[PDB]
Design a protein around this ligand. Structure first.
Ligand code: SAM
Ligand code: SAM
Lengths: 393, 392
């Protein structure tokens, strides 16, 4: 209500005078209560106007980034508009009008009528960092594709995009006959910025803590030879390291990391003690799975990137290598019907590259098509992220 | 302050509990909540809200384009499978797009397989001003916003003040045209534009702030003198509103002037009332062909152009005025820095060479035009005013 929102502002205001640090959960509770009050108070005209304002605040921020203006505003204190325009080489009038939009939305602050200053909301834009990179990637790489969607579906029909080719991203870029990865290989700077961002937001999903891997330990003791955990597309090998430190009875010596040759070379050179002690193979999981009869094959946050047929083909390669008692673990979102907002928004983005978040029923369909049977689903506490346990059917 | 904002919410909550609340009170409550948002949001909240806004916008645009909102009933619900069959599309992608709006509170899902409107999506289920206003921003401005960086790299970091080579014309690919001309050349974009001019009365009221009844007397001094010339009047909504408030002003004595393509469209879209006015194609950059009218009204025109172009537009009208003629500017008037809603539009308007102005900025322009301001009548519900002028 309006009253509980005021109560949380009073608590915040108090904790700030006392120098106590707000907690993350406290911050979300306050943002949540605000959104509930706005939902209750805003009329449709208010929602639509706020949506339009979001467009121009984003465009203002994009233009000031392009002009390198956030770098020139000091961390603290104020800079004169005239001084800012001189350092940019631009007309003070248009630079002032753009800042005025951000002043009226509380992104910037004016200290007189001629000086402007940062807030906590704009300091991330004043230098290189993962959040700025993520912001720019989503704006430059995603918003144009969002605008092209009606045109895209006019062209291909109102159909779920499921291929790796003729994606909406590639269609927007003008090369529908290339994959997104081939497009990005033609674009070093955009790929560089994407690494910084794609790496940061991976750490928002948990690797362990909601699924017990320790049942692998008995087999590690009955047999000296059987490979234990094969991580398919596991990147730097951090998942395997965590699993084996959570359960030291699982020798990382007997686990396998599979990725692309360029990523396996980085694991060997500047990788740490134990990941380097594990078998590292450069593979293409679209076409092959060399390790035969391992106890566990793991596919974490990968199937979301592909359509059903591509997932079934990936799964069928793994099933061909599985022994009768092998498990195939899929770590991914099992979205609800209907889905919560974060997975719903990820699913929307994924439609630009041919992927999707899948419901439980959709996961049963693709696993059944691969000759698998889901025996369990173990949920994390984070946005329906689960461990899906499968066996040969 | 957080503590002063809390006090605002507490007193507005008391007001609601005691019962109605006026438009000003709504606006003020929304305004306070936006102050709360500013005071409370951190970068990751700003990022999330940015992404959500673009994704929701895109999902709305697709469902509009596919005619989905029109097929969801005003009340009740409809199965995804019925929706899909009726639009001739794949049930899975349509479900996925609706699910996004279900998750963000725009649509509601019933059971496992049915979808329903909320008050947030009924505006998109048919033709109305609010929807037209939203479509104007999304179809006619958002792609242009994405062109601003390249545009300023093409022409320099300078305020865009010309009526040609606007960011909009730059994006449109028509360097030889004004924005008004670009709009006037496609029937659907023109029809949407006209309908949007009825929207956002809370910002751009058509009546309630200026009294026209002084005209009714003079209406008797002549059977043919034009009473109100509506310069760039779109489809005459403001003329119809004025002539309802003051029934002594006959609409037949008023002139609706706009671009050739716009005024022709008024012939098919307008009702018998406005079609009984004097419709007239003009180009107000070059001319005011009706000399000696009683009132020249310039409503939400100057906002669309830079200072020099405004002065030049005004000078053509001054030339046409009789000594007893009045020139009326109806438009937004904000402070500095601009308020929330005018600040949004000032940024939008830079793509077409215009801007939001203070009262002082308008006085400078009317002065350069050879006009004297005899009065400024502000609305008590919106930063909007009628500036009454005569020849100096
Ligand atoms: C979404 S990323 C990260 C997935 C990882 N399991 C995790 O927990 O984050 C998917 C990984 O798959 C790898 N990959 C992409 N294509 C591959 C292929 N054809 N064969 C093997 N690995 C591939 C990439 O190098 C990337 O590290
Ligand atoms: C912001 S709209 C205002 C419409 C209407 N006066 C109102 O306030 O609702 C600007 C109007 O000016 C018209 N316009 C633009 N350039 C024009 C020109 N050169 N000559 C005549 N009308 C023009 C547009 O077609 C549009 O109808």
């Amino acid at each position: 209500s309006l009253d509980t929102l005021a109560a949380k502002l009073i608590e915040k205001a108090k904790d700030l005078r006392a120098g106590n640090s707000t907690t993350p959960q406290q911050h979300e509770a306050l943002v949540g209560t605000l959104k509930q009050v706005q939902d209750a108070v805003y009329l449709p005209r208010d929602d639509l106007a706020a949506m339009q304002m979001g467009f121009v605040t984003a465009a203002a921020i994009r233009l000031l980034l392009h002009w390198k203006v956030f770098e020139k505003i000091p961390d603290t204190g104020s800079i004169r508009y005239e001084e800012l325009a001189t350092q940019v080489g631009g007309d003070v009038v248009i630079i002032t009008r753009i800042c005025w939009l951000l002043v009226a939305t509380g992104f910037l602050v004016q200290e007189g009528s001629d000086r402007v200053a940062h807030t906590a909301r704009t300091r991330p834009f004043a230098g290189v960092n993962p959040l700025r990179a993520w912001w720019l990637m989503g704006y430059d790489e995603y918003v144009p594709v969002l605008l092209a969607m009606p045109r895209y579906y006019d062209t291909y029909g109102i159909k779920e995009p499921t291929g790796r080719l003729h994606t909406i991203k590639a269609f927007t870029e003008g090369s529908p006959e290339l994959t997104v990865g081939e497009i990005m290989s033609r674009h070093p700077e955009r790929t560089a910025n994407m690494l910084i961002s794609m790496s940061a937001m991976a750490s928002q999903y948990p690797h362990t803590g909601f699924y017990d891997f320790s049942w692998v330990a008995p087999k590690a003791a009955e047999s000296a030879t059987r490979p234990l955990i094969v991580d398919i597309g596991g990147a730097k090998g951090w998942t395997l390291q965590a699993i084996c430190k959570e359960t030291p009875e699982i020798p990382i010596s007997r686990c396998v990391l599979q990725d692309l040759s360029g990523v396996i070379q980085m694991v060997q050179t500047v990788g740490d003690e134990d990941i380097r002690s594990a078998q590292l193979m450069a593979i293409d999981f679209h076409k092959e799975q060399p390790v035969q009869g391992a106890l566990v094959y793991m596919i974490r946050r990968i199937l979301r990137d592909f359509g059903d047929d591509e997932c079934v083909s990936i799964l069928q390669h793994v099933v061909a290598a599985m022994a009768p008692d092998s498990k195939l673990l899929i770590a991914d979102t099992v979205t609800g019907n209907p889905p919560s907002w974060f997975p719903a928004m990820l699913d929307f983005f994924l439609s630009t590259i041919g992927g999707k978040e899948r419901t439980e029923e959709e996961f049963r369909k693709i696993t059944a098509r691969a000759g698998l049977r889901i025996t369990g689903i173990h949920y994390s506490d984070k946005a329906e992220f689960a461990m899906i346990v499968c066996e040969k059917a």
